[PDB]
Design a protein around this nucleic acid. Structure first.
Ligand SMILES: [Cl-]
Ligand SMILES: [Cl-]
Ligand SMILES: [K+]
Ligand SMILES: [K+]
Ligand SMILES: [K+]
Ligand SMILES: [Mg+2]
Ligand SMILES: [Mg+2]
Ligand SMILES: [Mg+2]
Ligand SMILES: [Mg+2]
Ligand SMILES: [Mg+2]
Lengths: 160, 158
RNA sequence: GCCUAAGACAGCGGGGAGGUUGGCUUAGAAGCAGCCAUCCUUUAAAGAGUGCGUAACAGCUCACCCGUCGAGGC
């Protein structure tokens, strides 16, 4: 272990027990002015801390183990990429809606799958798109899971 | 396409060349309507450096002018009534402003700032104030950043 | 002896932000001729900036954070 790692897992543990609905979100690839915007807009509605995923999964694991329920131990299944713990009391559907609302248009990346559809966007197509000032991909905080009274809510379910 | 063009003008006295011209004349919109609309919304700030954002639609030649607030450096200088700040910051004093005025500059600029409370936006300003050898209240502005932290000043705030 | 499966080290990818083009000087000096200071904020973290670059910007880098990989690096 490292110093900060024991300290910082206790910070995350403390968070998870801090509130009812416990969500993993993803802030990977998201530009830093755009995170400050969102972070400002959700200030009194959720708490959001980013931290290493290996450590996020630790926290979750010990939080559940120490709350004596499995159904938090299962958020670690869905931890990938830029994974930040986000906790709050607003129910998972309102949190899907909030976070979506605070998505902001951005230029698609080279090699990326075009989410609107399926096709890989070459480096030069995107370099051109980016040149024009075109911003077609909807970007912001991205839910991986939410926990709420004995079950997991996977965006699979949350959109429609 | 759409082109955003961000430039620093002199408030009120914007011209059709250069800063505006080499940027906006390309896009094929009347450079004079823009120089007009800039000089309208920056009547107050006469003779100071001001940010100006031009959002143009190239196809439809249509535009909008979103004017900002001066650099906080410029603001500090203006409450002081001063030409030029310290030549060698922290090794001289250009002038001293009160806390209250700092609060005015702070309150004036909170939206451009990423600190959400007028305390810490004053702290930001202070940080500028210290960059040019201005003193906030006899003190190094640094000194009072921590005094704000200790709550020494929780009378002005809220 | 100190970093390392709570992921090192090495490569690569994403973040690298705001006040702000800090003050000064300067025709221009925007992290990056030069002098001075070198704070505050949002933060996972991001220097009033390591090296390119520009006339000045831009763009690229680098620190630093996340992410990949999985075993030693010193
Ligand atoms: Cl489930
Ligand atoms: Cl990131
Ligand atoms: K992460
Ligand atoms: K603000
Ligand atoms: K400057
Ligand atoms: Mg990069
Ligand atoms: Mg310079
Ligand atoms: Mg240079
Ligand atoms: Mg900091
Ligand atoms: Mg930086």
């Amino acid at each position: 272990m490292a110093p900060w790692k024991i300290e910082e897992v206790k910070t995350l543990k403390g968070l998870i027990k801090s509130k009812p609905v416990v969500a993993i979100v993803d802030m990977m690839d998201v530009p830093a002015p755009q995170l400050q915007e969102i972070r400002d807009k959700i200030r009194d509605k959720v708490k959001l801390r980013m931290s290493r995923n290996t450590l996020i999964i630790r926290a979750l694991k010990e939080a559940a183990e120490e709350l004596n329920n499995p159904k938090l131990a299962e958020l670690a299944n869905y931890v990938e990429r830029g994974a930040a713990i986000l906790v709050t009391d607003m129910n998972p559907f309102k949190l899907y809606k909030l976070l979506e609302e605070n998505k902001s248009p951005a230029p698609v990346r080279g090699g990326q799958i075009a989410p609107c559809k399926g096709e890989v966007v070459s480096p030069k197509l995107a370099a051109v798109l980016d040149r024009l000032g075109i911003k077609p991909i909807k970007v912001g905080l991205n839910i991986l899971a939410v926990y709420e009274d004995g079950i997991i809510y996977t965006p699979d379910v949350l959109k429609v | 396409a759409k082109e955003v063009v961000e430039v620093l003008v002199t408030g009120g006295r914007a011209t059709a060349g250069p800063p505006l011209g080499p940027a906006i004349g390309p896009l094929g919109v009347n450079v004079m309507q823009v120089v007009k609309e800039i000089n309208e919304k920056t009547k107050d700030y006469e003779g100071m450096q001001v940010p100006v954002k031009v959002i143009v639609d190239t196809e439809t030649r249509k535009f909008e002018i979103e004017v900002g607030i001066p650099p906080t450096t410029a603001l500090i200088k203006k409450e002081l009534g001063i030409e030029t700040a310290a030549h060698e910051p922290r090794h001289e004093v250009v002038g001293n402003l009160t806390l209250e005025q700092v609060i005015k500059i702070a309150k004036m600029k909170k939206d451009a700032m990423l600190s959400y409370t007028l305390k810490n936006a004053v702290k930001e300003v202070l940080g500028t104030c210290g960059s040019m050898g201005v003193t906030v209240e006899g003190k190094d502005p640094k000194e009072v950043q921590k005094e704000i932290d200790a709550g020494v000043y929780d009378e002005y705030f809220k």
